[PDB]
Design a protein around this ligand. Structure first.
Ligand SMILES: Nc1ncnc2c1ncn2[C@@H]1O[C@H](COP(=O)(O)O)[C@@H](O)[C@H]1OP(=O)(O)O
Ligand SMILES: Nc1ncnc2c1ncn2[C@@H]1O[C@H](COP(=O)(O)O)[C@@H](O)[C@H]1OP(=O)(O)O
Lengths: 335, 335
């Protein structure tokens, strides 16, 4: 396979290089692309060094089998025709195509078969917090149809890219040094704070991030489920956490949910109250699973189940999910 | 009015001194009590110095009108008869008496009249996170009965006392200097993390903090309301935040809720999405109101309302509520 990474400079682009090597993805040639800013930069991959080329509207994607894109929705909209011009499959981490009926929105553990039909030769990687949630919801859905979800998120600085991570760490330095915290990538100081706004507001006063959890979940799960989210930025480095209440059509006891989670692909059950075993972002960082715990009956609804889950936003919330889409297609002989 | 503070050395006892001064509570005599550890300690109040006495099983409370107590559950059990022996009204910030049906459990904005009837001469100050929630719930309850609540909390380090706040701050420094973080007053590192456990677990796998939000809310609101909480410790100094979903018997639209919050005692409405105005713990610190915003319709339930609120745990969550109970009684002629 000949593989492209479009947008290699940033956090997700760098994770693509790590994941593709950790998972021994079958590569016979690698092509790195960026803006004029990263053109000419050098990266090493599996012993060879590669030079980034500026993404231009040309024929650079002739002969490339898959392009993993982590360059922003503006780039993906502007250059989709270029990337797919010679039959390359574009697996896009951006939000650009997530609502297009002719472009599949795929989490392999949930709806991997949707990946097999791509009229535009584009497949969309879903929103990070949505991937996390539906990996956990799928084994529950298979026990009883999920009608409603309430979710409060606790989203890491990494959701705002590397610059968001850098702002947080510097604020830590300025606070231990009695200095002035610097505020720019976030709307307010993040250290010692919580910002209940992620992305811009929409006309129903939910944010775009909250509406993604509503709209993307329906597509992925092929479901009429209704998700109402409150998305909050928190002073955590790069794993996202979610407090989830699910309402199903019949009651699911914690023991049944536990059994389902323990067998569910992509899930790690971590739920031992008496040993203080529960998912935490500090320990879910740089791990593959969606980590699930604090499972209990919903005191407010006999048909409700409550739990808590954590996932690494750069891995399963982005690069890992995209690589798993490609792996799923390979296993189906798509190439 | 002769006033006692029982447990003056700690964060809550110090806040009693601050609030009582700030609000010009009418005081003719001040009597400070602690363990043998703080006996002999000197505190300044309104330009005079007071010397702490060890709390003993004696007649020290003869002549004292109200005793504000924050000395631990066991201390309140051990010494309630001493404190009330001569008719003193004991307003207790501990958990000890919160479930005793002959001890009122009071948030003045909600059920202030319950404070008028105290056959054991004890009134219990509720749990911090519960006070915050019911101040916001009451204006909604008055429009339509609340059947169910889902609440995710984002609880500050000060919930574990001054030493909890101390650990968070020191960790900030250690992480700044690249040292191993001191982990002691929390179960895991709190900086850059979230700990989805507040207080010990109970038999149904909710923690005692989550079960306080379940049980105390029923008592305060005289209601069959069922509250299901996930309580999470976060690296914030001393204000608590809550993401709340409320289900009522009829639909309450966001603008109806906003109008109710705008006139609700103890509430500050802070909700302008187009101006990025919403409650945040960094800005709710050392303030009196329960700050409410992010009000919107529940996409998962036509009879649901969603919002976000913030309050200072030492002020409205503890000492301010207790002083306000005393103020309520005084306004009703109780003394
Ligand atoms: N016009 C463009 N063409 C290709 N890649 C782009 C373009 N604009 C931005 N990118 C890339 O998108 C990524 C965005 O980073 P993040 O998503 O972490 O915020 C970077 O790798 C950036 O590369 P570059 O360094 O060349 O600007
Ligand atoms: N046996 C006791 N009698 C009176 N006050 C007590 C007793 N044990 C603890 N306290 C007080 O409980 C308060 C609250 O504890 P904290 O806020 O530190 O969690 C402290 O002021 C402490 O006072 P002391 O300093 O004398 O020990």
């Amino acid at each position: 396979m000949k593989i492209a990474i479009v947008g290699v400079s940033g956090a997700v682009g760098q994770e693509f290089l790590r994941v593709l090597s950790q998972r021994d993805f079958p590569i016979d040639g690698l092509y790195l692309f960026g803006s004029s800013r990263s053109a000419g930069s050098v990266y090493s991959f599996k012993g060879k060094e590669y030079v980034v080329r500026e993404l231009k509207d040309n024929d650079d994607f002739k002969g490339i089998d898959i392009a993993f894109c982590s360059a922003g929705g503006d780039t993906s909209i502007a250059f989709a025709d270029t990337i797919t011009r010679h039959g390359t499959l574009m697996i896009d981490n951006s939000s650009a195509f997530r609502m297009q009926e002719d472009v599949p929105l795929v989490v392999p553990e949930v709806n991997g078969d949707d990946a097999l039909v791509h009229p535009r030769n584009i497949i969309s990687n879903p929103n990070c917090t949505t991937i996390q949630m539906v990996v956990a919801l799928k084994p529950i859905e298979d026990l009883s149809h999920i009608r409603r979800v309430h979710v409060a998120t606790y989203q890491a600085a990494s959701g705002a890219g590397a610059l968001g991570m850098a702002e947080l760490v510097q604020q830590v330095e300025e606070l231990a040094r009695g200095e002035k915290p610097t505020v720019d990538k976030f709307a307010y100081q993040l250290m010692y704070n919580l910002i209940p706004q992620i992305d811009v507001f929409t006309d129903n006063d939910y944010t775009k991030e909250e509406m993604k959890m509503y709209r993307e979940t329906k597509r992925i799960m092929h479901s009429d489920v209704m998700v109402s989210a409150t998305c909050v930025r928190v002073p955590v480095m790069r794993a996202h956490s979610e407090a989830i209440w699910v309402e199903t059509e019949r009651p699911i006891a914690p023991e049944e949910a536990r059994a389902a989670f323990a067998k569910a692909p992509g899930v790690l059950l971590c739920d031992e109250p008496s040993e203080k075993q529960y998912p935490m972002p500090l320990f879910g960082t740089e791990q593959d699973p969606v980590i699930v715990g604090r499972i209990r009956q919903d005191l407010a609804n006999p048909n409700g189940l409550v739990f808590w889950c954590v996932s690494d936003q750069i891995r399963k919330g982005a690069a890992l999910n995209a690589v798993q889409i490609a792996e799923y297609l390979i296993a189906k002989g798509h190439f």
